[PDB]
């Protein structure tokens, strides 16, 4: 387990989530573009499964 | 099915390195061609070549390999899967190409974007310039990427992605568009077209060094009592 830059932001993910298109972000970041009813990988707009939750 | 088709399988089968599973691979293209499926799926089968490919397939599977180059591809592909491999360039595209993923590689240059391509993703690759887009685009996904500039956009894309590159001014949005990231570029002013997006549209700009009187124009109209324009996050 070492360092894992977030796609968008290069800052080791407090709580690195992986999407199932295996891109890496901030546990953070996604809560707030979900916020945003965006259910998708924001690096490669990927959709995400209906009520997703990181 | 083919005689000449398996003798060239059969020595690319005999000519791996250990790590490569190259007899898995070798059984699932002779069912392919024996059934003339429509798909051949070679992912995740630690391959550092593809040969010659089934003629008839219209979807390649080929993610998570290890390849560096692809052979020619069979035309009547309308989809390829080929993220994660370790791609330095990829061969002509075939007319029918609807679908194209191709991320997650280190591709420099793309070859021409054939008529028909409504999907293009190569997130995570090397590239330094883009190809003009087609006209029936609908997604174009290139974060990631060493992009100084982006090619105008086609009035039916509907998805943009470009964050993480060194793009400096964005051509006119279409109004078609519904999604567009937008992060860590270099943008200090935003296209007009940018407040006419529908007003469920998704606009992300954070990281850009947009100026003053951008932003001062910006605050102005999406804070405005009449804003019908798309939702603008700046962080
Ligand atoms: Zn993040
Ligand atoms: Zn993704």
Same mark, same amino acid.
């Given at each position: ?5 977030? +796609? ?19 546990? @953070?970041?996604? @809560?707030?573009?979900?916020? +945003? ?15 997703? +939750?990181? | ?13 005999? &000519? ?27 992912? /995740? ?8 490919? *089934?003629? !008839? ?15 020619? =591809?069979?035309?009547? =592909?309308?989809?390829?899967?080929? !993220?994660?491999?370790?791609?330095? #360039? ?8 609807? /679908? ?14 054939? /008529?028909? =391509? ?15 887009? *087609? *006209? ?8 990631? &990427?060493?992009?100084? %500039? ?8 509907? $998805? ?8 400096? !001014? ?7 568009? &519904?999604?567009?990231?937008?992060? &860590? ?7 007009? #077209?940018?407040?006419?997006?529908? !007003? ?10 947009? %100026? ?15 804003? %019908? $324009? ?6």
């Amino acid at each position: 387990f070492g360092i894992q830059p977030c +796609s968008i932001c290069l800052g080791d993910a407090k709580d690195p989530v992986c999407l199932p298109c295996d891109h890496v972000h901030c546990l @953070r970041c996604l @809560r707030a573009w979900f916020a +945003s009813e965006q259910m998708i990988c924001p690096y490669c707009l990927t959709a995400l499964p209906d009520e997703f +939750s990181p | 099915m083919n005689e000449f088709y398996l003798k060239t399988w059969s020595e690319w089968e005999k &000519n791996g390195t250990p790590g490569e599973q190259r007899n898995i691979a070798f059984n699932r293209l002779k069912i392919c061609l024996q059934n003339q499926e429509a798909e051949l799926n070679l992912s /995740e089968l630690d391959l550092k070549t593809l040969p010659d490919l *089934p003629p !008839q397939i219209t979807t390649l599977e080929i993610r998570k390999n290890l390849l560096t180059h692809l052979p020619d =591809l069979p035309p009547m =592909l309308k989809v390829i899967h080929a !993220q994660f491999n370790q791609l330095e #360039s990829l061969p002509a595209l075939p007319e029918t190409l609807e /679908e194209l993923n191709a991320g997650d590689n280190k591709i420099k240059e793309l070859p021409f974007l054939p /008529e028909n =391509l409504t999907h293009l993703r190569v997130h995570n690759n090397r590239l330094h310039i883009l190809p003009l887009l *087609p *006209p029936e685009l609908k997604l174009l996904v290139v974060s990631g &990427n060493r992009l100084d %500039s982006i090619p105008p956009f086609p009035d039916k894309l509907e $998805g943009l992605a470009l964050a993480n590159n060194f793009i400096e !001014q964005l051509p006119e949005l279409p109004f078609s568009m &519904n999604r567009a990231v937008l992060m &860590n570029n270099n943008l200090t002013t935003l296209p007009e #077209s940018v407040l006419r997006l529908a !007003q469920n549209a998704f606009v992300n700009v954070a990281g850009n060094p947009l %100026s003053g009187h951008t932003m001062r124009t910006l605050q102005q109209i999406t804070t405005g009592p009449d804003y %019908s $324009g798309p939702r603008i996050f700046f962080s």
